[PDB]
Copies of this chain bind each other. A is one copy, B any other.
């Protein structure tokens, strides 16, 4: 398998390629051509030009219909997309079929639809000569949108950014994670076979620092950079676009909490926290790495969760009943294992997991870890405050509502929080006090694509979703007519 860049409607190679590795078994899936600076520049110049081409003559209806045809194109090759994402990431085949690929199709459909329904504002005003004036606003393409996406939900997160960008009439230069370039390379083919005009969508492969990522980010021809990934990388990008005062949208790290109150459905909460901690092998920005449980139910909670955690089938993506795949890479497994060790040193009681499973097959050449649960760390322990991004959670008891609110908020992160309670007052009283972008009550990672999505503090900047995307990916222009 080989992965090429897609630039101005042509698939091209580079002066250097790098390896894409199947994390299940450590085998090489493909060679990926790393776009160099010159190739990045040629991508940005083509996107700039495509704005003055036929793409720019498209009506909002026709533009939307072509976008639906992109979505149709994915559905047409659906099983191939499942396969690509699995290969790259080792995610359960089932998860890719029901979450990753359908969501990516919905991303285009939703923004196409929004592109047709969205309108702007009329403001009337009086003037000293008694004739008055009109102010109306319009949404225009921002211009060239730089897209840099991570490896955890590769197609889902890539299209979450590309779909609104294109729905708003922009052109795109997009750099998917080095770890998961396949689904995106397939998307490039779909764009091509859909008739998407050359230069409208450009795919560049490579890494971050000193590679395609950084180059995109320093290129003066882009109008915006929308980014999803590590919080320190966001800060880096922010400095990098700062001289050109580019528009920026960041969705970054979390150290998310789940809170289980004494009046929760205990069974539901054990299940809910199971999913929030070990979905995608804990490799979601939204996962609950910290969990607080009311003292009256703490032991029974931990017991129930240890049990459910131990039932999880960690194995082949297509293995019957498989709940967990491996981590994305060996690099990332090193990091996580380091935290596993650090938790021990920090005084943690390992309730379950804490190492790597043994398969006695090619999987031992992969990057699996076990779902871990910890107990017994203080609120200041590095393991409770820093993002690990593995299938792991620490559980602590609490006694008071105000106490636990304060403990959830005592963080430099503020992405999401899940709350469990059956009490109507509590649910609304507590939810509005959590200093994050996203609260779920009695569920987790339930997504309505119209809602504003984003974090506070280190967890991000800006919001995406619904009109928040329609606004971010557009110039808002105000036009004032004296009458």
Q: Report yes or no: A482 in contact with B446, Cβ–Cβ below 8 A.
A: yes
- Stretch among A131-139, A201-209, A298-306 lining the B interface: A131-139
Q: Within 8 Å of chain B (Cβ to Cβ): is A456?
A: yes
- Stretch among A24-32, A119-127, A184-192, A330-338 lining the B interface: A119-127
Residues of B within 8 A of A241 (CB): 238
Q: Report yes or no: A437 in contact with B238, Cβ–Cβ below 8 A.
A: no
Q: Report yes or no: B239 in contact with A234, Cβ–Cβ below 8 A.
A: no
Q: Within 8 Å of chain B (Cβ to Cβ): is A295?
A: no
- Stretch among A314-322, A347-355, A374-382, A457-465 lining the B interface: A457-465
Contacts known (A451-B135, A461-B246); A482 close to B113, Cβ less than 8 A: no
Q: Report yes or no: B245 in contact with A126, Cβ–Cβ below 8 A.
A: no
Categorize the interface residue count of chain A.
35 or more
Most chain-B CB neighbours within 10 Å: which of A114, A426, A428, A463?
Answer: A428
- Stretch among A40-48, A56-64, A362-370, A390-398 lining the B interface: A56-64
Q: Report yes or no: B137 in contact with A438, Cβ–Cβ below 8 A.
A: no
Candidates B131, B242, B437, B476; contact of A454 at CB < 8 Å: B476
Residues of B within 8 A of A223 (CB): 456-457
Question: Do most interface residues of chain A lie in helix, strand or loop, or is the interface mixed?
Answer: mixed
CB contact list, A438-461 vs B, under 8 A: 438-443, 446, 448, 450-454, 456-461
Q: Report yes or no: B137 in contact with A431, Cβ–Cβ below 8 A.
A: no
Q: Within 8 Å of chain B (Cβ to Cβ): is A478?
A: yes
A49 CA / B208 CA spacing, docked (Å):
39
Q: Report yes or no: A453 in contact with B478, Cβ–Cβ below 8 A.
A: yes
Q: Within 8 Å of chain B (Cβ to Cβ): is A15?
A: no
Q: Report yes or no: B113 in contact with A432, Cβ–Cβ below 8 A.
A: no
Q: Say how far A414's CB is from chain B's closest CB, in angstroms.
A: 9
Residues of B within 8 A of A422 (CB): 423-425
Contacts known (A242-B239, A245-B238); A482 close to B442, Cβ less than 8 A: yes
Copies in the complex: 4
Q: Report yes or no: A432 in contact with B138, Cβ–Cβ below 8 A.
A: yes
Q: Report yes or no: A122 in contact with B124, Cβ–Cβ below 8 A.
A: no
Residues of B within 8 A of A456 (CB): 142, 223, 475
Task: Closest B residue to A425 by CB, please name it.
Answer: B483
Q: Within 8 Å of chain B (Cβ to Cβ): is A307?
A: no
Task: Closest B residue to A457 by CB, please name it.
Answer: B245
Candidates B60, B243, B458, B482; contact of A235 at CB < 8 Å: B243
Q: Report yes or no: B244 in contact with A458, Cβ–Cβ below 8 A.
A: yes
Contacts known (A126-B60, A126-B61, A422-B423); A439 close to B245, Cβ less than 8 A: no
A234 CA / B478 CA spacing, docked (Å):
22
Candidates B425, B435, B443, B461; contact of A480 at CB < 8 Å: B443
A458 CA / B246 CA spacing, docked (Å):
8
Residues of B within 8 A of A247 (CB): 461-462
Task: Closest B residue to A253 by CB, please name it.
Answer: B245
Q: Say how far A49's CB is from chain B's closest CB, in angstroms.
A: 14
A117 CA / B110 CA spacing, docked (Å):
8
Candidates B113, B136, B236, B429; contact of A122 at CB < 8 Å: B136
Q: Within 8 Å of chain B (Cβ to Cβ): is A427?
A: yes
Q: Report yes or no: A131 in contact with B425, Cβ–Cβ below 8 A.
A: yes
Q: Report yes or no: B133 in contact with A136, Cβ–Cβ below 8 A.
A: no
A359 CA / B298 CA spacing, docked (Å):
62
Residues of B within 8 A of A477 (CB): 432, 434, 436-439
A197-234 vs B: 1/0 string, CB under 8 Å? 00000000000000000000000000100000001001
Q: Report yes or no: B451 in contact with A478, Cβ–Cβ below 8 A.
A: yes
Can you identify 23 A-B contacts, CB atoms within 8 angstroms? A57-B130, A113-B117, A119-B123, A122-B122, A122-B136, A125-B446, A127-B446, A238-B245, A242-B242, A247-B461, A247-B462, A422-B425, A423-B423, A427-B481, A428-B479, A428-B483, A432-B479, A437-B477, A437-B478, A438-B480, A439-B479, A440-B482, A453-B478
